[PDB]
């Protein structure tokens, strides 16, 4: 007996066929377009989409005046509007099935740092997040796959201790000032 929880969960699935061209090609295009590191970051966002399609595909067999479909189905669309993947006029339960991987990958903090212009490339956003230069509303966020909600998109900035926004220079500029 222990006071520990052993409840864990894997967050990706690997494909059934390992060496398949045009699966390899499409995921490499999605790695290069969004600045991701390995295939497992695509297989992770493929997995949260496959959980959302599957739960909506279950809710589509119950009729329109079901209790469970009306409650749990309105709570599924609410999250997808909240993270900015769906829009507001498309809140029937059948524009869930028209979602794709790219809608979910456009909402990462990495691509949003690139979209707002705080970076100048999609790989420049990965480092600027990871070097702790990026904060969201007060809080330095150190994770590039931080899915930016819709209300937290207007507050993404440059982290008041950083040499980019705050002003105290880094390791390199101060040593060159010492050698001045």
């Amino acid at each position: 007996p222990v006071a520990r929880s052993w409840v864990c969960r894997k967050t990706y699935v690997t494909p059934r066929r390992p060496f398949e061209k045009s699966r390899l090609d499409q995921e490499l295009k999605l790695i290069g377009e969004y600045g991701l590191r390995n295939k497992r970051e695509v297989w992770r966002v493929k997995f949260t989409l496959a959980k959302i399609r599957k739960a909506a595909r279950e809710l589509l067999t119950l009729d329109e005046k079901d209790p469970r479909r009306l409650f749990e189905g309105n709570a599924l669309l609410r999250r997808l509007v909240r993270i900015g993947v769906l829009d507001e006029g498309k809140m029937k339960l059948d524009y869930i099935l028209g979602l794709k991987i790219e809608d979910f990958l456009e909402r990462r903090l990495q691509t949003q740092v690139f979209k707002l212009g705080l970076a100048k490339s999609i790989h420049h956003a990965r480092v600027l997040i990871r070097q702790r230069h990026i904060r969201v509303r007060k809080q330095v966020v150190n994770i590039p796959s931080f899915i930016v909600r819709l209300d937290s998109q207007k507050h993404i900035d440059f982290s008041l201790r950083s040499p980019y926004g705050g002003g105290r220079p880094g390791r390199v500029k101060r040593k060159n000032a010492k050698k001045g």
Binding site: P1, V2, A3, R4, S5, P67, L70, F71
Partner: protein, 262 residues
């Protein structure tokens, strides 16, 4: 085993105590007392977990050992004393008074009450027997035996106990049209009017109850506690009035109640 168990694991605790997973292996293990250990709230959970007065299971010892806590008007120096339904907790150093009533979701509740109401409690009659040179007795759900009862008290009714003397003042009988609270099952903590009582001889009576909104439900007879004569409760009720909201309108209450902010 050989002889009785003295420990309670945490996951094996009652669900309504709302103990989290990661604080320990063991749960407080109520002492034997008036209430079943599945039907009670120990005094350590009322002080540390609900009221946030204490912070550890040693401060509950330091609070109870100053004799600051009266459960039904008698001072209790056991931190795992099982307080149950309709039990009055008088803390006189601060000035509060609580009654343990279920709320609409199957748990207990912090129900602060006025010290003018804290002089009495209701009990439910459980067995009535004569004996010992023909002297009649009650047995209530607190194991309180009150000899010489009123002859019109029968089984499944409700008495009203005076807590300073121990004597019955007036009672309610089991009838239709009486206001009842469900004290067990999946309709627990719900308040409604008795509609109907179906008899099943050799099995359990089923008592159909009707809400104040129209929501009918049924229980077995043993999960039925007559609170009021007619529709007027002889005790106070919690913030919700014993009326269970479905989860859709329970969501609507939150998403409309946040819009009063600013």
């Amino acid at each position: 085993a050989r002889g009785p168990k003295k420990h309670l694991k945490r996951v094996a605790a009652p669900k309504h105590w709302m103990l989290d997973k990661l604080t320990g292996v063991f749960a407080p293990r109520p002492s034997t007392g008036p209430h079943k250990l599945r039907e009670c709230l120990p005094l350590i959970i009322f002080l540390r977990n609900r009221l946030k007065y204490a912070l550890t299971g040693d401060e509950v010892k330091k609070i109870c050992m100053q004799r600051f806590i009266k459960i039904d008007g008698k001072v209790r120096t056991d931190i795992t004393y099982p307080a149950g339904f309709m039990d009055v907790i008088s803390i006189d150093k601060t000035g509060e008074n609580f009654r343990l009533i279920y709320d609409t979701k199957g748990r207990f509740a912090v129900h602060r009450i006025t010290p003018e109401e804290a002089k009495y409690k209701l009990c439910k009659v459980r067995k009535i027997f004569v004996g010992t040179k023909g002297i009649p007795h009650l047995v209530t759900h607190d194991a309180r035996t009150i000899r010489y009862p009123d002859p019109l008290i029968k089984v499944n009714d409700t008495i009203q106990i005076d807590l300073e003397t121990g004597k019955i003042t007036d009672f309610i009988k089991f009838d239709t049209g009486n206001l009842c609270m469900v004290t067990g099952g999946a309709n627990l903590g719900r308040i409604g009017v008795i509609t109907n009582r179906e008899r099943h001889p050799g099995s359990f009576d089923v008592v159909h109850v009707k809400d104040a909104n129209g929501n009918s439900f049924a229980t077995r007879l043993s999960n039925i506690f007559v609170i009021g004569k007619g529709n007027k409760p002889w005790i106070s009720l919690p913030r919700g009035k014993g009326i269970r909201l479905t989860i859709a309108e329970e969501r609507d209450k939150r998403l409309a109640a946040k819009q009063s902010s600013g």
